[PDB]
Amino acid sequence: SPQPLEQIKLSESQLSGRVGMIEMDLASGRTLTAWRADERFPMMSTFKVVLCGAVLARVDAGDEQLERKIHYRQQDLVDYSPVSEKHLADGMTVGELCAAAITMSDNSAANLLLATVGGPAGLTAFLRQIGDNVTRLDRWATELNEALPGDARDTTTPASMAATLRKLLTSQRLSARSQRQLLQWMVDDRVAGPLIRSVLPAGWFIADKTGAGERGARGIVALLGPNNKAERIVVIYLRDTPASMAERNQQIAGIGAALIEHWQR
């Protein structure tokens, strides 16, 4: 594979879409590779990691409990609720809802959690509280993936999302237990984790949350590194490409291949 930046450019050319990417040292925040890092991209389901960061902050403050059982109804369900549709009778705990939202991309679980933090506006206020003045959530689970051209709703930038993920996982804004929990939910992703491991060389750590939307929108927020360590945050978003899901997945994997082959920088 060519150098990371060269591969990212080739991906735009081949997809006829915009790619946004940041490679950041998790421990220090040093930005290593950046491309359209300050441009806007729909977050799609990747917003679920920030959502659970807001939930964890409420737990730390004594305003929420991961054990709290939420009983919900069938009319509360939205498109794609693999886990939540199975618990209409017994409900799910707040912690279970976060595991479902992050590890299975369960949309109803995400919406139930979103309401507890004050809806899209409340999650946006949490982002401003931790110093992210760019990322914004405006709609609910299904509707936020529309990715209309030029629509700033439900967007982030690679740079803001990477900085926000680092703040949630390592800045001590969240308690030690909460930082560990958020990381473990990413490590446990069932949608893409196993698939990524199947193509990663031996020795590489992966934790992640992916997302997809209209007009080719696709994205992943991840922790990656050799020697089985979460060395760097890697955020890649794609938008406005007519390419098949398979080719968008392949182009993202290709950027990963470039990073892996040329990791020392």
Ligand SMILES: OC[C@H]1O[C@H](O[C@H]2[C@H](O)[C@@H](O)[C@H](OCCCCCCC3CCCCC3)O[C@@H]2CO)[C@H](O)[C@@H](O)[C@@H]1O
């Ligand atoms: O010399 C480096 C490596 O070259 C190949 O590894 C390939 C691997 O066989 C292929 O499957 C992968 O595709 C890339 C898979 C990327 C997976 C996901 C990346 C995500 C993770 C973080 C966020 C963005 C993308 O590339 C590597 C590097 O060329 C060899 O198979 C491997 O033994 C060797 O150690």
Ligand SMILES: *C(=O)/C=C/NCC(O)CC=O
């Ligand atoms: C999180 O990103 C959920 C996205 N749902 C929309 C789709 O999966 C459709 C992608 O083509």
